Amino acid sequence: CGSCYPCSCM
Ligand SMILES: [Cu+2]
Ligand code: NA
Ligand code: NA
């Protein structure tokens, strides 16, 4: 990250 920080959704 994003809205799943820390990822892997990115
Ligand atoms: Cu992330
Ligand atoms: Na960031
Ligand atoms: Na990813």
From Swiss-Prot:
Entry superkingdom: Bacteria
Keywords: Copper, Copper transport, Cytoplasm, Disulfide bond, Ion transport, Metal-binding, Oxidoreductase, Peroxidase, Secreted, Transport
GO BP of this protein: copper ion transport
Induction remark: By low copper concentrations.
Cross-link annotation Proline 5-hydroxy-oxazole-4-carbothionic acid (Pro-Cys), location: P6-C7
Major localization class: secreted
Sequence positions that bind Cu(2+): C1, C7
Disulfide bonds: C4-C9
A single Gene Ontology CC term: extracellular region
Molecular function per GO: metal ion binding; peroxidase activity; superoxide dismutase activity
Locations listed in the record: Secreted; Cytoplasm
SUBUNIT field: Monomer. In the absence of copper, may exist as a dimer or an oligomer.
Function: Chalkophore involved in scavenging, uptake and suppression of toxicity of copper. Each apo-methanobactin (apo-mb) complexes 1 Cu(2+) or Cu(1+) ion to form Cu(1+)-mb (Cu-mb) which is then taken up by the cell. Enhances growth rate in the presence of copper and reduces growth lag upon exposition to elevated levels of copper. Cu-mb contributes to the switchover from soluble methane monooxygenase (sMMO) to the membrane-bound particulate MMO (pMMO) by inducing transcription of pMMO subunit A. It also stimulates the enzymatic activity of pMMO.
Protein name according to UniProt: Methanobactin mb-OB3b
Organism: Methylosinus trichosporium
Lineage: Bacteria, Pseudomonadati, Pseudomonadota, Alphaproteobacteria, Hyphomicrobiales
